[PDB]
């Protein structure tokens, strides 16, 4: 509700960009080592290691560029990381 | 979203009926409005 309530930000110099957001995802909580390998993290390991038990929130953005002459193209970057939710 | 009539004993308003309004969706904070009755042509 928050995400789809947030108004789209139309910024332009000209090319204009609204950066529309439409859908969210939550994957199960995961940890990335120094190497970066995503792995499943149990609560006991979090406590023993002083980590945070959290899940990464993903939104599927939809950006459309409208500069002039109906030069419209909907760019959507599926599963764009936004934050991690505890 | 409900109307509450209070009165403060040490005050310049006989009454004041507030309504801490808020659209049910968390769109913006609550915007209060008061409708008072000036004390004692």
């Amino acid at each position: 509700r928050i995400v789809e309530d947030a108004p789209p930000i139309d910024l332009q110099a000209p090319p204009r960009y609204l950066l529309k957001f439409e859908q969210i995802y939550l994957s199960k909580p995961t940890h990335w080592e120094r190497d970066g390998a995503p792995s499943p993290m149990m609560p006991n390991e979090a406590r023993l290691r002083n980590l945070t038990y959290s899940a990464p929130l993903y939104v599927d953005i939809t950006k459309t560029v409208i500069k002039e002459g109906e030069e419209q193209l909907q760019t959507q970057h599926q599963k764009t990381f936004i934050g991690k939710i505890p | 979203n409900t109307v509450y009539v209070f009165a403060k004993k040490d005050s310049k308003y006989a009454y004041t009926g507030e309504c801490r309004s808020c659209l049910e969706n968390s769109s913006r904070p609550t915007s209060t409005i008061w409708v008072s009755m000036l004390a004692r042509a």
Partner: protein
Amino acid sequence: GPLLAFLFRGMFKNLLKEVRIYAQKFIDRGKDFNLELAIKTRIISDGLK
């Protein structure tokens, strides 16, 4: 629920403003801008944490 949504609402608003700043500077310089550099993900992560 309500408390944590109060936080998320504020912090998402700030994400959106910061993305406006980033998009604006690069568009002002006449160049395109990458989302993945526009979205300073740490805002929501570290705000909630």
